[PDB]
Amino acid sequence: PIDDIVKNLLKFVVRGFYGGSFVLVLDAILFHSVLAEDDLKQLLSINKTELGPLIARLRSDRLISIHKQREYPPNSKSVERVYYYVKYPHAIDAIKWKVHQVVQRLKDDLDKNSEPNGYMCPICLTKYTQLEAVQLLNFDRTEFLCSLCDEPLVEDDSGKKNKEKQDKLNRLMDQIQPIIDSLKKIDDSRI
Amino acid sequence: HDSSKLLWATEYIQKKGKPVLVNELLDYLSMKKDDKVIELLKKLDRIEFDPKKGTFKYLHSPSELLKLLRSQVTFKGISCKDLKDGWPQCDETINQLEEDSKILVLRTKKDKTPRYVWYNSGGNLKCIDEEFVKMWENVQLPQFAELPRKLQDLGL
Ligand SMILES: [Zn+2]
Ligand SMILES: [Zn+2]
């Protein structure tokens, strides 16, 4: 079943960009379709302080949403059981959206450091740019002054940092490859 | 008593913790001199009794740990109580067998990190700096079905 790969993918990201404890609750929720609240509680045998945000993260991750699995109490009351409805369609909605968000962000970091164009005065600790440089450039001053401190300017965003963002990208592409490949394998059916 | 002799002999066998002659077992604690303890050893797993030579044992590797970790798939979560007794200093193996080769559940740094059953693909994956993890937290996963349009807005 492809839905298992979705759950299998959910383990990867919840263990790749999250901790190990983030998958045991993910295991527990997906262990049973309609699982009682206490049954999950006895599995971990720890406090709710180490369990609450894990489900809240998963509900915020939109992979699984706690559903109102209504149960009729036997004591002339109505107390429901907290069974999560694993929201597979929203999983690809949320998780992939971040991947698209981070990749363009790291793409932004690439061209920011790609070539040193903006300038800066270390005395004033303020960045500048070429358009500021030219209007500040003088025939006598072959460099760029800083009228705020009356100091020469220095360049910013040297060529080294462009490699760092690319190396971030290369790690980004490699480390998200198992996530996306397991995500794009779901794109065939959208389940 | 019958149970007190069995309990003391089991602790004494645990205190001895070594395979020795059954005759020496009685004289080590000076209590298991009756056939009741010998029959209890054959009938109870606290004291190991076999038709072979006098020897009582307990009734061990990361490979076994991984298989034991794999032995708890879609089941309850186990503790390292048998893992550390069946393999002393098993917590170190977890540190040595990193990259999911030995997953664990570190409760806290005040109880020797009492671990639990866990298997993973990456396990640690430490090379992703917390800065990427922070921006992962800094970016909040957005709201409801507007998001399929939102990723469509981004071009997905
Ligand atoms: Zn300045
Ligand atoms: Zn929402």
The C-alpha angle A91, A97, A103, rounded to 5 degrees, equals 135
Phi, psi for residue B118 in degrees, rounded to 5:
-160, 135
Q: Are A120 and A154 in contact (CB under 8 A)?
A: yes
Domain final residue pick, A72, A89, A106: A89
| C-alpha pair distances (Å), B130 with each of A17, B136, B156 | 9, 9, 27
User: If you search the block for the tokens 């008593």, which residue do you land on?
Assistant: B1
Question: DSSP for B23-35?
Answer: HHHHHHHT---SH
Tell me how far apart the alpha carbons of residues B130 and A108 are, in angstroms, rounded to a whole number.
19
Look up residue B5 and give its two tokens: 């002799």
Look up residue A58 and give its two tokens: 């998963």
Q: Which residue of B has its CA nearest to A175?
A: B128
Q: Is B155 on the interface with A (CB under 8 A)?
A: yes
Q: Are A156 and A120 in contact (CB under 8 A)?
A: yes
A31, A94, A175 member nearest B141 (Cβ): A94
Nearest CA-CA partner of A171 in B52, B62, B125: B125
Q: Quote the domain boundaries for residue A32.
A: 1-89
Q: What's B117-153 look like in SS3?
A: CCCCCCCCCCCCCHHHHHHHHHCCCCCCCHHHHHHHH
* The total number of structural domains that make up chain A: 3
- Residue A67's DSSP bridge partners are A83
Bridge-based pairing of strands A119-121 and A151-152 is: unpaired
Tell me how far apart the alpha carbons of residues A86 and A91 are, in angstroms, rounded to a whole number.
9
User: If you search the block for the tokens 């180490």, which residue do you land on?
Assistant: A50
Kindly state whether residues A55 and A133 are assigned to the same domain.
no
Give the type of residue at B19.
Answer: P
The secondary structure of chain A in percent helix, strand, coil, rounded to multiples of 5, reads 55, 10, 35
Tell me how far apart the alpha carbons of residues B57 and B61 are, in angstroms, rounded to a whole number.
18
Tell me how far apart the alpha carbons of residues B94 and B84 are, in angstroms, rounded to a whole number.
11
Kindly state whether residues A67 and A104 are assigned to the same domain.
no
Kindly state whether residues A102 and A184 are assigned to the same domain.
yes
Q: Taking the CA of residue A3 as centre, how many other CA atoms within 13 Å lie in the half-sphere pointing to its CB? A: 8
**For testing the chain B interface, which of A95, A97, A105, A168 should be mutated: the one with the most B CBs within 10 Å?**
A97
Tell me how far apart the alpha carbons of residues A90 and B143 are, in angstroms, rounded to a whole number.
10
User: If you search the block for the tokens 């300017």, which residue do you land on?
Assistant: A153
Nearest CA-CA partner of B6 in B49, B50, B40, B33: B40
Tell me how far apart the alpha carbons of residues A49 and B95 are, in angstroms, rounded to a whole number.
25
List CB contacts of B103: < 8 A, sequence separation 6 or more. A20, B69, B94, B118, B119, B120, B123
Phi, psi for residue A81 in degrees, rounded to 5:
-110, 135
Give the type of residue at A140.
Answer: D
Q: Taking the CA of residue A28 as centre, how many other CA atoms within 13 Å lie in the half-sphere pointing to its CB? A: 26
Burial B2-11 (b: 16+ CB within 10 A, else e): eeebbebbbe
Kindly state whether residues A125 and A171 are assigned to the same domain.
no
Please give, rounded to a whole number of angstroms, the shortest distance from the CA of B154 to a CA of chain A: 7
| C-alpha pair distances (Å), A92 with each of A7, A10, A63, A187, B113 | 11, 10, 8, 9, 34
Nearest CA-CA partner of A12 in A1, A27, A2: A27
Query: Is B49 strand, coil or helix?
Result: coil
Kindly state whether residues A70 and A132 are assigned to the same domain.
no
A20, A27, A97 member nearest B151 (Cβ): A97
Angle between helix B146-153 and helix A88-112 axes, rounded to 10 deg: 30
Stated in angstroms to one decimal place, the resolution of this structure is 4.0
Kindly state whether residues A69 and A122 are assigned to the same domain.
no
Kindly state whether residues A122 and A110 are assigned to the same domain.
no
Kindly state whether residues A2 and A22 are assigned to the same domain.
yes
CB contact under 8 A, B116 and A24: yes
Kindly state whether residues A16 and A46 are assigned to the same domain.
yes
Look up residue A42 and give its two tokens: 């006895």
**For testing the chain B interface, which of A13, A21, A93 should be mutated: the one with the most B CBs within 10 Å?**
A93
Kindly state whether residues A153 and A185 are assigned to the same domain.
no
| C-alpha pair distances (Å), A177 with each of A33, A168, A182, A184, B8 | 29, 14, 8, 10, 59
Kindly state whether residues A73 and A136 are assigned to the same domain.
no
Kindly state whether residues A120 and A154 are assigned to the same domain.
yes
